[PDB]
Design a protein around this motif. Structure first.
Motif, PDB file in Angstrom:
ATOM      1  N   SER A 596       0.845  -1.159  -0.130  1.00  7.21           N
ATOM      2  CA  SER A 596       0.062  -0.002   0.277  1.00  7.21           C
ATOM      3  C   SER A 596       0.934   1.310   0.064  1.00  7.21           C
ATOM      4  N   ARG A 599       1.689   1.785  -3.566  1.00  7.85           N
ATOM      5  CA  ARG A 599       0.858   1.799  -4.631  1.00  7.85           C
ATOM      6  C   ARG A 599       0.060   3.169  -4.448  1.00  7.85           C
ATOM      7  N   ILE A 600       0.141   3.654  -3.041  1.00 10.18           N
ATOM      8  CA  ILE A 600      -0.535   5.077  -2.772  1.00 10.18           C
ATOM      9  C   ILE A 600       0.458   6.278  -3.362  1.00 10.18           C
ATOM     10  N   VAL A 602       2.617   5.893  -6.010  1.00 12.94           N
ATOM     11  CA  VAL A 602       2.528   6.071  -7.587  1.00 12.94           C
ATOM     12  C   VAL A 602       1.279   6.494  -8.044  1.00 12.94           C
ATOM     13  N   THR A 603       0.088   6.110  -7.225  1.00 15.55           N
ATOM     14  CA  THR A 603      -0.998   7.080  -7.502  1.00 15.55           C
ATOM     15  C   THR A 603      -0.831   8.096  -7.089  1.00 15.55           C
ATOM     16  N   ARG A 606       0.894   9.748 -10.221  1.00 12.87           N
ATOM     17  CA  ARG A 606       0.177   9.807 -11.452  1.00 12.87           C
ATOM     18  C   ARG A 606      -1.250  11.266 -11.509  1.00 12.87           C
ATOM     19  N   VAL A 607      -1.636  11.108 -10.297  1.00 15.34           N
ATOM     20  CA  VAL A 607      -2.793  12.160 -10.106  1.00 15.34           C
ATOM     21  C   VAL A 607      -2.320  13.340 -10.103  1.00 15.34           C
TER      22      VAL A 607
ATOM     23  N   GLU C   4      -6.888  -2.362   1.700  1.00 17.58           N
ATOM     24  CA  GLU C   4      -6.050  -3.271   0.826  1.00 17.58           C
ATOM     25  C   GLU C   4      -6.575  -3.451  -0.453  1.00 17.58           C
ATOM     26  N   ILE C   7      -7.540   0.317  -2.325  1.00 17.15           N
ATOM     27  CA  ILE C   7      -6.216   0.871  -2.707  1.00 17.15           C
ATOM     28  C   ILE C   7      -5.822   0.563  -4.013  1.00 17.15           C
ATOM     29  N   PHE C  11      -5.649   1.931  -7.545  1.00 15.90           N
ATOM     30  CA  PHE C  11      -4.292   1.827  -8.071  1.00 15.90           C
ATOM     31  C   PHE C  11      -4.336   1.465  -9.660  1.00 15.90           C
ATOM     32  N   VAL C  14      -6.482   4.189 -11.934  1.00 17.56           N
ATOM     33  CA  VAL C  14      -5.771   5.202 -12.091  1.00 17.56           C
ATOM     34  C   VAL C  14      -4.668   5.136 -13.256  1.00 17.56           C
ATOM     35  N   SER C  18      -4.740   7.386 -16.718  1.00 20.67           N
ATOM     36  CA  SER C  18      -3.591   7.928 -17.124  1.00 20.67           C
ATOM     37  C   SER C  18      -3.150   7.793 -18.597  1.00 20.67           C
TER      38      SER C  18
END
Ligand SMILES: CCCCCCCC/C=C\CCCCCCCC(=O)O[C@@H](COC(=O)CCCCCCCCCCCCCCC)COP(=O)([O-])OCC[N+](C)(C)C
Ligand SMILES: CCCCCCCC/C=C\CCCCCCCC(=O)O[C@@H](COC(=O)CCCCCCCCCCCCCCC)COP(=O)([O-])OCC[N+](C)(C)C
Ligand SMILES: CCCCCCCC/C=C\CCCCCCCC(=O)O[C@@H](COC(=O)CCCCCCCCCCCCCCC)COP(=O)([O-])OCC[N+](C)(C)C
Ligand SMILES: CCCCCCCC/C=C\CCCCCCCC(=O)O[C@@H](COC(=O)CCCCCCCCCCCCCCC)COP(=O)([O-])OCC[N+](C)(C)C
Ligand SMILES: CCCCCCCC/C=C\CCCCCCCC(=O)O[C@@H](COC(=O)CCCCCCCCCCCCCCC)COP(=O)([O-])OCC[N+](C)(C)C
Ligand SMILES: CCCCCCCC/C=C\CCCCCCCC(=O)O[C@@H](COC(=O)CCCCCCCCCCCCCCC)COP(=O)([O-])OCC[N+](C)(C)C
Ligand SMILES: CCCCCCCC/C=C\CCCCCCCC(=O)O[C@@H](COC(=O)CCCCCCCCCCCCCCC)COP(=O)([O-])OCC[N+](C)(C)C
Ligand SMILES: CCCCCCCC/C=C\CCCCCCCC(=O)O[C@@H](COC(=O)CCCCCCCCCCCCCCC)COP(=O)([O-])OCC[N+](C)(C)C
Ligand SMILES: CCCCCCCC/C=C\CCCCCCCC(=O)O[C@@H](COC(=O)CCCCCCCCCCCCCCC)COP(=O)([O-])OCC[N+](C)(C)C
Ligand SMILES: CCCCCCCC/C=C\CCCCCCCC(=O)O[C@@H](COC(=O)CCCCCCCCCCCCCCC)COP(=O)([O-])OCC[N+](C)(C)C
Ligand SMILES: C[C@@H]1CC[C@@]2(OC1)O[C@H]1C[C@H]3[C@@H]4CC=C5C[C@@H](OCCC(CO)CO)CC[C@]5(C)[C@H]4CC[C@]3(C)[C@H]1[C@@H]2C
Ligand SMILES: CC(C)CCC[C@@H](C)[C@H]1CC[C@H]2[C@@H]3CC=C4C[C@@H](O)CC[C@]4(C)[C@H]3CC[C@]12C
Ligand SMILES: [NH3+]C1(Cc2ccc(Cl)cc2)CCN(c2ncnc3[nH]ccc23)CC1
Ligand SMILES: [NH3+]C1(Cc2ccc(Cl)cc2)CCN(c2ncnc3[nH]ccc23)CC1
Ligand SMILES: [Ca+2]
Lengths: 632, 172, 39
Positions: A596, A599-600, A602-603, A606-607, C4, C7, C11, C14, C18
């Motif tokens: 997490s 992933r949080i 790289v999110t 991108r955002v 989990e 998210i 992930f 997104v 993109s």
């Protein structure tokens, strides 16, 4: 990578250098260092052999290299990523050392070498007088590679247990014919030796050919006492003995069951030597207990002679252990043998016995009614005290078990830790003892009895005694009525305070100490117990077959084990290694790029980008319709 | 280094003053233990005089510590020095000694077989009780170590905390 | 309904979106080039 380049890499100041390499070049040359000194690979080899210790021998210091080095394809090396890994570690270049470690072969071996080299430089940095110690830095670098070696072993163990055990014992041929499991012991790298894989191996080396899932200890002890029952025991096949290192004479016999082979497999297993010594050691104590409790005459009894024989021959077997150990220098053979609690105790026990035998035996028997001959008495009394050593050595035998052994190791660790609480208790004792004696016994002259009286009864008070009828000596039920006098009414008050302090404060604090430290001492003691199985089990491979009464014949007649692989099995093993190293890096990246926290973010990135783009659309998309307002 | 400099560096280090007082303090107790256990006559022994000298001079050194402290006002010099368990105990120990010396020494030796002179007895018995203070001050020296020192501080904290459980026990 | 699991499907979307805005960003440039050229 040629020799002249690899020279330059050691002899360069245009980068981050280790200031203590030069401080090591000196000690191996013993004093000589001109200012225009260019380091040579002969001198690097001597640093490595010094740091790696023992009997390690580097390829730089061999006949083949010394000639071609003096002469100067052939200036090349067959394995240059090894030569650079050593360079990067001697130069204190960790980020380069990690990179070069990942390239090449024998990854687990190289990691255990690096751990050793940094650990030895850390020690010299402590022992040397420099501005920055750098030793916690080097100690940190040693534990980084040491953790990698452990993580690779767990990876191999989860893939194939038998091939992982082979990995611990094959010779390396670029690392002085050494062994990954030997390198880890040399660094005292305990999570590797305490690992399930190599504990499994030590348990298979303990068996020998004996298949000890079918058999039980009922039947091994029986077969020692009943020799022909050796034939009705289940043994192992050569296929089941393939990951286990063996002696030369062993593999021959396994290669060819015949009757004489089935005895050889039995009497050369370490488990059998253990019980075959254990039973002789217990028969020894029974007699020496009989001798010390039963009246002793001028001439020794048959029981006493047998006791003298065992301790004499036992002592001989301890001498050879010293002069036949893995260390090759005497002073190292000595210090390592005295690094064991019970070998120190046996040294005292052996020496103290023959002093006592000398007095007991070399005493002039002036008849007088013995115990009028005071040289005989001292001899016997040394026996009566020396036997304590030989009961406590039974804890050495009992520590072979998994449950008992850690507790035996805790007892030593806790005596060391409870020291200062016990010093305080000894102070409270004298704080009471000296006034008690002074008030109750004033008319005394100097004597060494004063030293007993201030310490004796206060000690016994800790252990459940109160001396009830000695409190208040002026009472009618008192046992000390001659002691009543001025100021004796104070001693009950004193003793009431004394026992309040010792039990209600100091005994319960000590209980509370242990309750709160038990777990982490127990955890350390389990790992320490497992690390020392190695030194224990590997000794029995070298011990003789007969125990210390009859060993004498094994000595007179007398006057390590290796893992053997055919070439296709060496090939299958080097493939197993490469595969498991690939799996290791792969699963490491996946766990990283599946979390997490990863992933949080790289999110998060991108955002941030897409926000810029829609704006980079939002301005433009306005600018499209302005035609159909204007063009239209 | 010069020779005289190398001595100065030694005798002015705090570690050296510590052990150089510690050893004198232990030699002190050994004698005062000898004096209190061995028969006492009308006149003090050479052991007893040395003991009287130490406590007299020890007391002087405690006075200067008060009147040469970081606080600049007397009442602050006082309260801060009495903020230590063992400085309070030394105050009692010093005062109680010289009461005992006074009686032991200023007693009219009507010969009678001593311990028929009850002023002498009180003096000696105060010594026998006062020596307790001087064994317990060894915990002050021992608390300089990292392992022992915290346990010495626990003992005080736990006596305070176990108070009411002990009051209930005294009621039972 | 867990974090989990939310998210990660977030992930994944997104990552897709993109690609799409870029698949808009190249095209949306290519719209106005008329009202610079056609106009
Ligand atoms: C040590 C290294 C080798 C190890 C093996 C050693 C074993 C060697 C075995 C045997 C040797 C025994 C000696 C023979 C003496 C015979 C004398 C006699 O006439 O009869 C005696 C019988 O013997 C006794 O009473 C002695 C006590 C026996 C103790 C046995 C304990 C160990 C047994 C092993 C168990 C191991 C099992 C495994 C562990 C669980 C009569 O008594 P006494 O002695 O004459 O009494 C003194 C009287 N007097 C002086 C007035 C005359
Ligand atoms: C790996 C490390 C551990 C092993 C280390 C090995 C260490 C070896 C252990 C100890 C050795 C050292 C101990 C001192 C020796 C005895 C001295 C003594 O008391 O003598 C006595 C006499 O002596 C005799 O009567 C002769 C008997 C003694 C010889 C046998 C023991 C010593 C030899 C080695 C055997 C073991 C060799 C083992 C081989 C390895 C003197 O006393 P006395 O005469 O009665 O005095 C008064 C007499 N009077 C009344 C008549 C006036
Ligand atoms: C003629 C008479 C002959 C017979 C009599 C003599 C019989 C023999 C005597 C005693 C019986 C002992 C049997 C235990 C074996 C159980 C199996 C086991 O798990 O072993 C463990 C015990 O490993 C040891 O080494 C144990 C210690 C040996 C005995 C210690 C004597 C001192 C104890 C007394 C001191 C207090 C005395 C106070 C009270 C008197 C080791 O195994 P593990 O690590 O758990 O893993 C299994 C590995 N394995 C099975 C492959 C090995
Ligand atoms: C009398 C007035 C009161 C005073 C009495 C005092 C008596 C004391 C007597 C005896 C106790 C002495 C033991 C000292 C051990 C010190 C070594 C040690 O710390 O452990 C080491 C050995 O590790 C072991 O496993 C040792 C096991 C030995 C057990 C011996 C028990 C003897 C019982 C006898 C029974 C006979 C009884 C009857 C006899 C007639 C391990 O080293 P480590 O891991 O590096 O340790 C660091 C620990 N730390 C980092 C956690 C801090
Ligand atoms: C605590 C609050 C106050 C409570 C109330 C008052 C108590 C407080 C104060 C005072 C009480 C002290 C006097 C008691 C005398 C009674 C006994 C007696 O008759 O003679 C006594 C002699 O004793 C002496 O000659 C002197 C004794 C006192 C000196 C030591 C002081 C100790 C306490 C100081 C510090 C305490 C501070 C502690 C604070 C926590 C005993 O001897 P005897 O009986 O004559 O024996 C004859 C034997 N014969 C026949 C063989 C010869
Ligand atoms: C205190 C502040 C300064 C500190 C240092 C102080 C040290 C000063 C040193 C020495 C001074 C000693 C005095 C000399 C008296 C000699 C008298 C004589 O003839 O012989 C006596 C020998 O002496 C004894 O028996 C006395 C007891 C010795 C106690 C030593 C403990 C301290 C030692 C220090 C250790 C420190 C090591 C460090 C700590 C680990 C005979 O005995 P007596 O006394 O005659 O017995 C009475 C008999 N009568 C009355 C019937 C006659
Ligand atoms: C930082 C804070 C801590 C330090 C604070 C310092 C505090 C200082 C500590 C204590 C001072 C106060 C205690 C009381 C004094 C004794 C009283 C006494 O009993 O006298 C006695 C006599 O006296 C003599 O015979 C003379 C000997 C006493 C002088 C030496 C001690 C006091 C002086 C100061 C020395 C230390 C100075 C230290 C310098 C700093 C009376 O008893 P008696 O005569 O036997 O009675 C009957 C006699 N009859 C039988 C004949 C009838
Ligand atoms: C800050 C305070 C400083 C000043 C303190 C001032 C105090 C000074 C006090 C008093 C001085 C007294 C001297 C004269 C005594 C008169 C009585 C007498 O002569 O005889 C009587 C003595 O009987 C006794 O009990 C005398 C001893 C009691 C003293 C108790 C002191 C308490 C100290 C506590 C500690 C406090 C420490 C506090 C520390 C923070 C009777 O006996 P005798 O006739 O001799 O015997 C013959 C008997 N025959 C028949 C067996 C033969
Ligand atoms: C002629 C004869 C002469 C010789 C004999 C006399 C020899 C001297 C006497 C005793 C031996 C003491 C040796 C300890 C030193 C170890 C080093 C150490 O770490 O020190 C620590 C101990 O610091 C202290 O202050 C310790 C306490 C001092 C002694 C206390 C006496 C009372 C104890 C007995 C009461 C019970 C009695 C009951 C049983 C009788 C402080 O250091 P640290 O904080 O841990 O860090 C290291 C810092 N450093 C090394 C830079 C300092
Ligand atoms: C008889 C019937 C039963 C009754 C008997 C009773 C007996 C009792 C006797 C004695 C005990 C008295 C101790 C009181 C301490 C109180 C101060 C304190 O709390 O700590 C302070 C000092 O910190 C320290 O470190 C002090 C250390 C002194 C240890 C003295 C031990 C004496 C042993 C003598 C051996 C001699 C034995 C033999 C003698 C002949 C720290 O202050 P704090 O940190 O603010 O504390 C708050 C704590 N809290 C917030 C956690 C709550
Ligand atoms: C901190 C610790 C507390 C205090 C303490 O240790 C340090 O200080 C020590 C001083 C010791 C005494 C010094 C000298 C002697 C003389 C000797 O005279 C032989 C007489 C006779 C024998 O039969 C032959 O003639 C007898 C012993 C004695 C009185 C010592 C006793 C113990 C004492 C009190 C010790 C005590 C435990
Ligand atoms: C002070 C002298 C003269 C008298 C006797 C001293 C006492 C304390 C000696 C004599 C015999 C000694 C024991 C002999 C053997 C051992 C086994 C060892 O593993 C731990 C210590 C231990 C348990 C010793 C402790 C101390 C001991 C009991
Ligand atoms: N030999 C012991 C116990 C043992 C352990 C395992 C087995 Cl299989 C059998 C017996 C008992 C001494 N010990 C030791 N002694 C002194 N100092 C030390 N520091 C670390 C260990 C030790 C090392 C283990
Ligand atoms: N002097 C002590 C112990 C000590 C500590 C450190 C060293 Cl290096 C040496 C000795 C013993 C008294 N104490 C104390 N006394 C009374 N009340 C208190 N409140 C907090 C501390 C104290 C303060 C420390
Ligand atoms: Ca009891």
């Amino acid at each position: 990578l040629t020799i002249p380049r690899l020279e330059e890499l050691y002899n360069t100041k245009q980068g981050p250098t280790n200031p203590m390499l030069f401080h090591l070049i000196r000690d191996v040359k013993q004093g000589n260092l001109p200012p225009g000194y260019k380091i040579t690979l002969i001198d690097i080899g001597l640093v490595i052999e010094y740091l790696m210790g023992g009997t390690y021998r580097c390829t730089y210091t061999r006949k083949r290299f010394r000639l071609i080095y003096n002469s100067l394809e052939t200036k090349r090396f067959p394995y240059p990523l090894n030569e650079l890994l050593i360079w990067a570690c001697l130069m204190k270049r960790q980020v380069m050392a990690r990179f070069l470690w990942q390239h090449g072969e024998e990854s687990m071996a190289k990691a255990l070498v690096a751990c050793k080299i940094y650990r030895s430089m850390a020690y010299e940095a402590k022992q040397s007088d420099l501005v920055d110690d750098t030793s916690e830095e080097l100690k940190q670098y040693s534990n980084d590679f040491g953790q990698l070696a452990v993580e690779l072993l767990e990876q191999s163990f989860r893939q194939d247990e038998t091939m992982a055990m082979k990995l611990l014992t094959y010779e390396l041929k670029n690392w002085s014919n050494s062994t990954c499991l030997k390198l880890a012991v040399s660094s005292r790298l305990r999570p590797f030796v305490a690992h399930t894989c190599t504990q499994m191996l030590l348990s298979d080396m303990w068996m020998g050919r004996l298949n000890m899932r079918k058999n039980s200890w009922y039947k091994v002890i029986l077969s020692i006492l009943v020799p022909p029952a050796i034939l009705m025991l289940e043994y192992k096949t050569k296929a089941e003995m393939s990951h286990i290192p063996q002696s030369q004479d062993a593999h021959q016999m396994t290669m060819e069951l015949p009757i004489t082979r089935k005895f050889y497999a039995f009497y050369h297993a370490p488990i059998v030597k253990f019980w075959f010594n254990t039973l002789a050691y217990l028969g020894f104590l029974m007699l020496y207990t009989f001798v010390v409790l039963v009246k002793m005459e001028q001439l020794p009894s048959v029981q006493e002679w047998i006791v003298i024989a065992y301790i004499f021959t036992y002592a001989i077997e301890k001498v050879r252990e010293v002069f036949m150990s893995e260390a090759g220098k005497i002073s190292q053979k000595i210090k390592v043998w005295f690094s064991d609690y019970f070998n120190v105790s046996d040294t005292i026990a052996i020496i103290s016995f023959f002093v006592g035998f000398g007095l007991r035996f070399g005493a002039k028997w002036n008849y007088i009614n013995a115990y009028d001959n005071h040289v005989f008495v001292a001899g016997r009394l040394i026996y009566c005290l020396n036997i304590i050593f030989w009961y406590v050595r039974l804890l050495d035998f009992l520590a072979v078990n998994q449950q008992a052994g850690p507790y035996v190791m805790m007892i030593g660790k806790m005596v060391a830790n409870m020291f200062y609480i016990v010093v305080i208790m000894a102070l409270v004792l004298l704080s009471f003892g000296v006034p008690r004696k002074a008030i109750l016994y004033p008319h005394e002259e100097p004597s060494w009895s004063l030293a007993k009286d201030i310490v004796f009864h206060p000690y016994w008070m800790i252990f459940g005694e109160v001396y009830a009828y000695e409190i208040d000596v002026c009472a009618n039920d008192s046992t000390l009525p001659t002691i009543c006098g001025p100021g004796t009414w104070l001693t009950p008050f004193l003793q009431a305070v004394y026992l309040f302090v010792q039990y209600i404060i100091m005994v319960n604090l000590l209980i509370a100490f242990f309750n709160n430290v038990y777990l982490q001492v127990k955890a350390i003691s389990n790992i320490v117990w497992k690390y020392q199985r190695y030194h224990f089990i590997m000794a029995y491979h070298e011990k003789p077959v007969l125990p210390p009464p009859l060993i004498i014949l094994s000595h007179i007649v007398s006057l390590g084990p290796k893992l053997f692989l055919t070439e296709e099995d060496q090939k299958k093993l080097h493939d197993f290694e490469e595969q498991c190293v690939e799996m290791y890096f792969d699963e490491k990246d996946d766990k990283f790029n599946s979390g997490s926290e990863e992933r949080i973010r790289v999110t998060f990135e991108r955002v941030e980008q897409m926000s810029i783009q829609i704006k980079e659309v939002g301005d433009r998309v306005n600018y499209i319709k302005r035609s159909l307002q204007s063009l239209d």
